[PDB]
Each structure stands twice: as C-alpha cells, then as structure tokens.
Amino acid sequence: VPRGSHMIVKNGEKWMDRYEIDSLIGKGSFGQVVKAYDRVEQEWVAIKIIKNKKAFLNQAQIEVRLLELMNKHDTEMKYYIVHLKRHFMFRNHLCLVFEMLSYNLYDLLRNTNFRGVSLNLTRKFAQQMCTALLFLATPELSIIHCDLKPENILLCNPKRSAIKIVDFGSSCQLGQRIYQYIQSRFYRSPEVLLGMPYDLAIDMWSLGCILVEMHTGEPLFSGANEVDQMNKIVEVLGIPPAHILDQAPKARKFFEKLPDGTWNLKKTKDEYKPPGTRKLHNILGVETGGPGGRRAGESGHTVADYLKFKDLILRMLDYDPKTRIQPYYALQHSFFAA
Numbered sequence: 072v073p074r075g076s077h078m079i080v081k082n083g084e085k086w087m088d089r090y091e092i093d094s095l096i097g098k099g100s101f102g103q104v105v106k107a108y109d110r111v112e113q114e115w116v117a118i119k120i121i122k123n124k125k126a127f128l129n130q131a132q133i134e135v136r137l138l139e140l141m142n143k144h145d146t147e148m149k150y151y152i153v154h155l156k157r158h159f160m161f162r163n164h165l166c167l168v169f170e171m172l173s174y175n176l177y178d179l180l181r182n183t184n185f186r187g188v189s190l191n192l193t194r195k196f197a198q199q200m201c202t203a204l205l206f207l208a209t210p211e212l213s214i215i216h217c218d219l220k221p222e223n224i225l226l227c228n229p230k231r232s233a234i235k236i237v238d239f240g241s242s243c244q245l246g247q248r249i250y251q252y253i254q255s256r257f258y259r260s261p262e263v264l265l266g267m268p269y270d271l272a273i274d275m276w277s278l279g280c281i282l283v284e285m286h287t288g289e290p291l292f293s294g295a296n297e298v299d300q301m302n303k304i305v306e307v308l309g310i311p312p313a314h315i316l317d318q319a320p321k322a323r324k325f326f327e328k329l330p331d332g333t334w335n336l337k338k339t340k341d342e343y344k345p346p347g348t349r350k351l352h353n354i355l356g357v358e359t360g361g362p363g364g365r366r367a368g369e370s371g372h373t374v375a376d377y378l379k380f381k382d383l384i385l386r387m388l389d390y391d392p393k394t395r396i397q398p399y400y401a402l403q404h405s406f407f408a409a
C-alpha cells in the first residue's frame with residue numbers, strides 16, 4: 072500500500088489496455104490531470120486522478136453527481152459545461168475521464184502579454200458564460216460553481232472562441248453551506264466576504280470581474296487578503312448599502328457604523344483611493360480609446376459599445392444579490408443585441 076496520497080503515473084504507460092498516458096496537464100490540491108489517448112474511442116481525453124484522501128474523494132463524488140445530473144438535460148446549453156465521459160477506480164484512485172479541451176482564459180491573456188483580448192471576443196466569452204449560468208440556474212440543477220476564474224474557463228479549440236466551464240469540485244446546490252471559505256479571492260463576491268447567505272448570484276459577480284480582466288489584461292480587484300479585497304471593491308463601487316451592512320455578520324471586519332447609523336471604512340492599524348472614485352468608466356477607457364488607449368483606431372470598440380459593456384458589468388457587480396442581474400436578463404442586454 073503506497074504511503075503518499077498521489078498516484079504514480081509514468082508518461083508513455085498504458086492503463087487497462089486502453090488509455091495511453093501522454094503527459095501531465097496540471098497538478099492541484101485534488102490530485103492531478105493527465106492527457107491520454109483512449110485507443111478504444113480513438114480520441115484524446117483529460118483524466119482527472121483524485122488523491123487517495125477522504126476530503127478530495129468527497130469533493131470528487133459531488134463533482135461526479137453534479138456532472139451526471141447536468142448530462143441528463145436535452146438543452147444545447149449543457150455543452151458550455153465540460154463533458155464527463157466516464158469514471159472508474161484504478162490503482163485505488165477515483166479517475167474522472169473528461170473530453171480533451173485547449174488552454175484556459177488565463178493562458179489566452181498571457182499570450183496577449185496581459186494587454187487583453189478585443190471587445191468582440193469578450194462579448195463572445197460573455198454570451199457563452201451567461202448561457203452556462205442560465206443552464207446551472209435550471210431549478211432541478213440550481214448549481215453554484217463557486218470557483219469561477221479565468222483558469223476554470225477553457226477554449227474547446229485554440230483557433231476558436233467556443234468555451235467550456237471546468238472543475239465543479241468546490242460546487243454546491245442552492246441553500247447548501249459546505250466549505251468555510253469559497254470562491255477564489257480576486258473573484259469573491261461581497262456577500263461571501265461579509266459572511267452573508269449566498270446563492271447563484273455569487274457566480275454572476277465572478278463573471279463580472281472575469282470579463283473586465285479579459286478586456287483589460289489585469290484583475291479588477293487584486294486583493295492580497297480579504298481586507299485588501301474588500302477595500303479594492305470599495306475603491307470602484309463605494310461603501311455597500313446600509314441595508315446589507317446592517318445584516319452582515321462580518322461587516323465590522325471591514326467597516327464601522329458611525330453614531331448617525333452611516334457606514335465608513337474601518338480605521339487601519341497605521342492608502343486606498345477614496346470610495347467610489349476608481350470609476351469603471353475610466354478602467355475600461357469608455358471615452359479614451361479603451362484600456363490604456365490601445366483600442367482607438369480599431370473597429371468594434373466605439374464609445375456606444377463600451378457604454379453597453381460598462382452598463383452590463385455594473386449590473387453584474389451590484390452589491391445587492393437580490394437585484395444583481397440574473398443570466399436570463401443578462402442574455403437580453405443590448406451588449407448582445409450587437
């Protein structure tokens with residue numbers, strides 16, 4: 072019986088006279104992902120190998136149950152989600168066999184040298200992601216992904232704009248509270264930072280952040296810790312509304328209630344732009360040729376196009392999760408008309 076939790080995997084070895092192991096795609100907390108040729112189906116697959124560890128095996132059983140639930144739906148909307156082909160036990164590890172995809176949206180940004188992709192490509196990513204979220208919001212699914220980030224959104228083909236969401240290892244269904252901290256820090260919703268109840272809206276918050284990063288090349292809110300994260304949100308969006316902070320268990324981590332009942336930033340031990348003064352209008356360069364002026368003298372980047380982009384993002388970054396734009400209504404936004 073092996074001492075480590077990981078599976079030993081030798082490039083070039085062949086599993087069950089079927090999977091020819093090519094190379095390591097990625098490592099993580101969960102275990103590893105390998106590129107393999109399925110000699111039976113004559114196609115590439117990505118094999119996700121789960122650590123022989125109770126917590127990761129539990130997360131992977133949740134991922135299997137949610138992916139298999141999604142598979143039973145007829146709608147074409149399900150093809151924005153990575154397809155789990157099959158799962159088995161091999162050498163005492165749970166192995167998930169997925170369709171092989173191309174590189175993630177972070178890799179794509181790195182290929183631009185973090186200058187961002189065009190508004191037209193951003194629009195195509197946005198429409199596919201809102202469609203994916205509409206699918207997850209189907210009542211019989213009600214799935215919160217809980218870890219949307221550029222690294223979890225993969226191109227199907229390196230030449231094309233088609234994308235798929237991966238990694239439902241941290242996911243839950245509406246009304247569940249399983250893990251103490253959720254969402255990747257840069258993409259973490261205000262309701263999660265505040266310890267308030269969360270629903271499918273946290274995913275629309277993450278999507279708002281992601282789409283700005285895809286067009287500018289840089290994370291909108293790049294916090295080094297939760298206090299820094301909330302302070303960077305506040306630079307762009309202002310102090311959250313009183314009706315939220317009055318109900319937030321962790322309001323006093325970030326904010327203080329003054330004698331007149333109004334909320335301010337908490338005094339530091341002893342730096343940020345004043346609240347609401349880092350305008351998304353200027354981050355996007357609506358009137359000034361896009362990010363760093365680099366999109367003036369290109370087409371598909373008009374002031375009119377930027378205003379529609381800005382208006383949709385600010386609906387996704389609503390502090391109030393009951394009024395934040397829902398996928399069903401995001402898809403009807405004029406940003407998608409053209």
Ligand SMILES: O=c1[nH]cnc2n[nH]c(-c3ccccc3)c12
Binds near residue numbers: 097
């Ligand atoms: O990481 C991955 N790289 C390339 N193709 C992939 N297909 N599915 C995955 C994957 C699926 C679930 C969780 C993590 C990665 C891939």
